[PDB]
Amino acid sequence: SLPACPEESPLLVGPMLIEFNMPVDLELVAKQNPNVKMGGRYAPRDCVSPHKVAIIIPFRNRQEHLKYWLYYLHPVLQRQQLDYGIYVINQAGDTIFNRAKLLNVGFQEALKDYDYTCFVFSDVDLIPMNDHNAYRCFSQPRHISVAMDKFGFSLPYVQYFGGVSALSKQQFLTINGFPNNYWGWGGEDDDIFNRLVFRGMSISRPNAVVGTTRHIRHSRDKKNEPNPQRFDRIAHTKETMLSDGLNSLTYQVLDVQRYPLYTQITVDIGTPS
Ligand SMILES: CC(=O)N[C@H]1[C@H](OC[C@H]2O[C@@H](O)[C@H](O)[C@@H](O)[C@H]2O)O[C@H](CO)[C@@H](O)[C@@H]1O
Ligand SMILES: O=c1ccn([C@@H]2O[C@H](COP(=O)(O)OP(=O)(O)O)[C@@H](O)[C@H]2O)c(=O)[nH]1
Ligand SMILES: [Mn+2]
């Protein structure tokens, strides 16, 4: 007997001030966010959200960015009236990073907790500047971080699909999820764009003003060097997507930690095969 949440949330305040130069205390963030439940889960008390959103962050050795991520997103996500949870998908070991494989793990592991039907994929260091930028799913795949400060507040190219995006369960399944063999930096987001287009879809986006996004400036991570096979890889997505992705995924979860503001899944995703 709770009614549906309004279609657009009435709590939104639009543009917001964002800064990355003060310390963050997650204990304090937890106290400021008393309705977020153990594991970083929240649904609204007064109405039923149609948006069952798992937010999936690929992660290694970025604890500082993450505290800022949690400090800023958590209040935005409750204002958006989402039935959501946060998953940080922490790559075990010290071998070459694999952004997309981690995202696949996140989708698959999150589905074990709850009937999520929408998946937000968000890099850890991207903070939206306007709460009108909806962190949930549309009838087409949604690109969220459309106007990033580091790209001069516009898209670096019109097919860019990096940074932050959202796919319904069905859209994700329809493309066999993401590729597993993009190791080191670059290209996997293009592959994922290619995948959507070969399955008859197109990219939905908010306007550049609402989609304004801040990137936390940081220097290079070691163990995520530009993948030099990225350019061949994206040229063949149509064939490779058939048998690379969800339907060829394995991993070994080493540990699951329910922190107050997020679930962290530590996972062994291997090295190139
Ligand atoms: C394949 C790849 O590296 N994609 C990057 C992307 O690289 C910038 C890029 O612009 C494309 O349109 C050209 O096709 C390519 O050769 C490069 O000049 O940059 C974005 C954002 O940094 C990454 O998300 C992609 O992975
Ligand atoms: O060592 C790493 C490499 C990357 N990432 C995650 O993968 C994303 C993509 O990499 P990156 O920050 O390098 O993008 P860039 O801003 O350099 O273009 C990051 O935002 C993090 O979520 C991480 O947590 N640890
Ligand atoms: Mn970054």
What backbone phi and psi angles, to 5 degrees, belong to 70? -70, -40
Query: What's the gap in Å between 123 CA and the centre of ligand 2?
Result: 6
Experimental approach was: X-ray
Domain at 124, CATH number: 3.90.550.10
Which one of 63, 124, 148, 264 would you pick to mutate in the ligand 2 pocket, going by the greatest count of ligand atoms within 8 A of its CB? 124
Name the residue range of residue 118's domain.
Answer: 1-273
Q: Resolution of the coordinates in A?
A: 2.2
Nearest Cα to Cα of residue 179 among 114, 118, 98: 98
Q: Is the separation of the CB atoms in 132 and 199 below 8 Å?
A: no
The Cα–Cα gap between 171 and 195 comes to 10
Supply the residue whose CA is at minimum distance from atom 17 of ligand 2: 220
190 in ligand 1 pocket by Cβ < 6 Å?
Answer: yes
Q: Does the annotation flag 199 for ligand binding?
A: no
The Cα–Cα gap between 105 and 267 comes to 8
Kindly give the number of the ligand 2 atom that is closest to the alpha carbon of 125: 20
186 in ligand 1 pocket by Cβ < 6 Å?
Answer: yes
Q: Does the annotation flag 187 for ligand binding?
A: yes
**Over the Cα atoms of the chain, what is R_g?**
18
| Strand stretches in 118-259, DSSP E | 118-122, 126-128, 142-143, 147-148, 164-168, 212-215, 252-258
Nearest Cα to Cα of residue 184 among 67, 57, 70, 99: 99
Nearest Cα to Cα of residue 194 among 168, 229, 232: 232
Q: Does the annotation flag 125 for ligand binding?
A: yes
Q: Does the annotation flag 214 for ligand binding?
A: no
The partner residues of 126 in beta bridges, in order of sequence, read 215
| Number of domains observed in the structure of the chain | 1
Q: Decide: helix, strand or coil at residue 12.
A: coil
Nearby residues of 165 by Cβ (< 8 Å), 6 or more positions away: 120, 121, 141, 142, 143, 144, 145, 192
